[PDB]
Amino acid sequence: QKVHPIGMRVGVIRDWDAKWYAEKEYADYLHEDLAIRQLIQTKLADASVSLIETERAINKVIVTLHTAKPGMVIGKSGANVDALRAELNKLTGKQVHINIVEIKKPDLDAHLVGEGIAKQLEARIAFRRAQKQAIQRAMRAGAKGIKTQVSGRLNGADIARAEGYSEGTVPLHTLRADIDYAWEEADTTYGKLGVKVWIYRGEVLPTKKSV
């Protein structure tokens, strides 16, 4: 067994991705907006997913979005998330909201580093030098405690290989874990690849106290 850091942060120790309240249909709009978030992450299929926080509001919805860069994802000039935003209006039928914000430096994101290097694992990269390469890029770019994780499954193999350069002070048992973390399965004919990226630039993360 291993504890998930974001699995004990992002609910209440870090504030919600569904960062809004309701009265009765809280899990209704919450869960169906999570299906909408699935539609975002699957209809950025010619883009780069970074983070999204769809919201319900006083105007019964405010969709909070994030991109990995505005210059390529949001459109030719910004009309892919806008025309696809009106496509979400013809999905769920509501006032529908764009939020063009780049998640800053996505070489310090666990999504684009690990998922990008996992797409290059689909392109058959030497995974050890991929580990040293990517975690050297972000550890080079700060990341006070930074590691990752890759599973095995090479054309009828065992569960998981080792994980070189899985380093960095990540005191996951302790209650100071400010980690952009991710995980991934790469489904191939030869098997699947789990990619789990611990990024620890910030030190502290309770987000639960307010006067």
Added chain:
Amino acid sequence: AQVQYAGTGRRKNAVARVRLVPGTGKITVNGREVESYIPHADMRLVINQPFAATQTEGSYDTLVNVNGGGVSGQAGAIRHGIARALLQVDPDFRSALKRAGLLTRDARMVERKKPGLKKARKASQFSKR
């Protein structure tokens, strides 16, 4: 009646809003007897170490207001509510409050139980199959 002395002590999901009358030692709990609210249960005589036997003695008509708890709950509210209430009428009983305690309202209780466990300290049984 007259205005309170703010006797704010309790224990174990009880409330002892102890009405505090400078009197003779008369005990009347919610206009009643606590042997009429929870008969009886010698905790009536474990009002004395909260109030009467405290320093031998403290003599005031405490018209005690309580609810919640029970023969140890609101008798702990007798302890902190009426010992601390005795401190509210007369603050010269900390010789007894740090001769014997009668404070902290410790609220020792049962754990934040692990789901799956019955009493968090007991299983069904096991022999060895």
Added chain:
Amino acid sequence: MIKFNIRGENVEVTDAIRAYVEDKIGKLDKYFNDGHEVTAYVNLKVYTEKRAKVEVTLPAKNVTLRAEDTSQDMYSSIDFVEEKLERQIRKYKTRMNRKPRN
């Protein structure tokens, strides 16, 4: 002795070599005092016997000890693993009898 629980947990049960189980645990009933409970729990699979798993657990009245061990043949697992139960009781002589060590 008192009670068994014979369990072939992948293949059906056949009481020739299960009777051979019953006779070598008959020699457990040469090394018994109260054969309180045992349980056979065996496992054989596909691909021309790339394993032979067997098991019997031993809740006697004071000690408990199971045996999930292997050979290539299931017959050889009954052989060498119940002989391993014999040599386990050979390990359990002083571990049983010599409650004085001096």
Added chain:
Amino acid sequence: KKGPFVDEHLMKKVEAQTNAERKSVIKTWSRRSTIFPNFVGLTIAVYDGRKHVPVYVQEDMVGHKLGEFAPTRTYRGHAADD
């Protein structure tokens, strides 16, 4: 009970065989059947799932459902019981 409950299509075979002829079996379905006093003296089938059981009725058959007309709850039965 108050607000009673009863068959529908083989109620229309109570009313399609009470008037016409008291003879035939039915591809029945009923966890929802009864028996009326008029119903006594005829033959009906019981849907176990393979054998539409051809039982005539006697007045003893009080208004139960075809889930318990005859014990078609197949359990063999005469092997090791009691």
Added chain:
Amino acid sequence: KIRIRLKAYEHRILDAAAEKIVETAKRTNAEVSGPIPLPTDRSVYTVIRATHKYKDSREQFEMRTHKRLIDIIEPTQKTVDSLMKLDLPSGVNIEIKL
């Protein structure tokens, strides 16, 4: 008789700082019974910590409810002109009643 619940699943996020956009209704108004921390209403979840087999342990999630009221007897409908603005968060369980 304007009375404001900030009913919150937890008041102790930025919806505690939602007490100031209704303090825009405390100003341009008088006789303010201010922040009333209401008795929290709790909620229970118990779920299998594993997926399908080997249930040694479970998990619990106590969704509580930390609420809020301000009680002003006078409406003073320039504070109804302040009723149009309501900033943080996107959606909170706010009640602004008479």
Added chain:
Amino acid sequence: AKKSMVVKNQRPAKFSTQAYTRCERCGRPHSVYRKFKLCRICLRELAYKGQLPGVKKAS
């Protein structure tokens, strides 16, 4: 089977006596919070993340 056990209860059956509800990711059987319209087991798959004011560390 994912469609006779997801799509089938989406299709109108007789009653609540027949079409028992569940979450809409995978039609998992009961132990389903109908007060929050989602399965325990499938809502746990969210509770990897969790969008709930409940304390996350298994109280």
Added chain:
Amino acid sequence: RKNRAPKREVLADPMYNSIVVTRLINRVMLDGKRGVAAQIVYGAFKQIEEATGNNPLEVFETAMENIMPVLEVRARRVGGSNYQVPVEVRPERRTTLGLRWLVTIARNRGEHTMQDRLAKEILDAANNTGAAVKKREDTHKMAEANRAFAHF
């Protein structure tokens, strides 16, 4: 375990003035039924109150003399050579074991009420003979076999 981890204390009686009133509640009291327990204890000094009508401590303390032995036993081995080398523990534990004795014979007798078979053993405790003095001499006669201390 390792330490002298702390015990707990119940309060002594103001009614009949013994801590073994409420410790007699600590053995007769089952399922936490302290009011019924005090009904039996106060009913037992009521059993004194019919028989003698004296102080509770005559029958209760002569009973304590009957049920507080001098010696108790202990298993101490060489390598199996279990010399039952004895000890003589203090009156809180000796009084505790005597409370096990009066809850034993004043519990397990097939008579009418708890105060009736406990009238048999509190009233026969007022007869101060038989089961209690034998219930300590059963260990007292063993001490000559418990003569060895750490010898071999």
Added chain:
Amino acid sequence: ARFAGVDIPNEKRIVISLTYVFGVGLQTSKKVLAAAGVSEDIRTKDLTSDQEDAIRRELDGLKLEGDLRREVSLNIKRLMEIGSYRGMRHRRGLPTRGQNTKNNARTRKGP
């Protein structure tokens, strides 16, 4: 007669002195405890002199104790083969609730 004159105990109320009897009990034996006006009564080793003579036919409302025997008998022994989905289970011997007979109900089920 005799019904009330059958097998007198002492020491009791008539209600337990009639649940004591095969039949008349806590509804009806308390009903005729009051209808004969008995009320504990006895604990006496005397019933009455003449509340017997009330409670002959005042007691005789149950039809009958011997036809409780013939009411179980007359009921079920006609009620043999309605199915016999219930009669076979009742008289083979399992408690025919439609009851889960896997392990337990061990005494009536038969070990």
Added chain:
RNA sequence: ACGCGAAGAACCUUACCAGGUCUUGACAUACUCGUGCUAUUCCUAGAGAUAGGAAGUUCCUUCGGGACACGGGAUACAGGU
């Protein structure tokens, strides 16, 4: 390992089987077409399915029709819990 998945499957819910039980597949993304508002509601029989009929479908934009794709000819393969 057994108050176990399954903290409620009256039952089609069910996994799996019996029977009625079909084979563009109930659920299907898929090439193509005479071309469209799919209506609901029914009625008949039948255990209901599932079939027959009634109005239930003959284009919402520069008009193919997108739009309800209508129902089909069919690569395509979802649908094994």
Added chain:
RNA sequence: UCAUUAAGUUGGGCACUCUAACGAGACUGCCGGUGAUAAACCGGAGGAAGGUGGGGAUGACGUCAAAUCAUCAUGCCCCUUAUGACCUGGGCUACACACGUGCUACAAUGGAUGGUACAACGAGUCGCGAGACAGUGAUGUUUAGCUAAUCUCUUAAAACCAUUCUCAGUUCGGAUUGUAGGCUGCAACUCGCCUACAUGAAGUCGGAAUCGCUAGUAAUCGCGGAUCAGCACGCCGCGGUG
């Protein structure tokens, strides 16, 4: 507290419940015997709390190839007339028999006699659902209130005195049963109950043994969720006694 009586409920009294939104509140903090010198220990006072006040969490390098092919999938297999389905009820829970398995008893602390006082107690004016009621109760008859710090829940039990059965297979002990009714739903046997009632079996304290229990800890008593039309001793948490 101006109370000033349906009444905590009021034109009102306001921290009183402290209500929970906040800070400060116990850190060897201080002291003595100390410790090689230190880390620490032993204790004392203070300190509401004293030595990480207490309780959850925090599963590590790694192990068990075990579980997840019924979330999640590739290797190949049946994937297209089939292990893919619509309907229908019967199985899925069936019982010669072992352990998993709690409650109930055997009894006088029980069992009747009554009237308590309590934390809980969360969903909800979607539904809970009054002192309006036929009642034996299911449920109606009314649904009052009910967007909950309203309301029906939420008035839980033991301790309380009242009488007896004070001795026994026992006002027993509750195995059924036969019913005679209601609730749920389209339908209560498979494959829910519940309310009677009548009969009311074992059972008279439990082999070998096992397991748990050093604080509100065992023991114990209740509440709700829990699933859900219906349906929960053990099934989550909370506390009432101790």
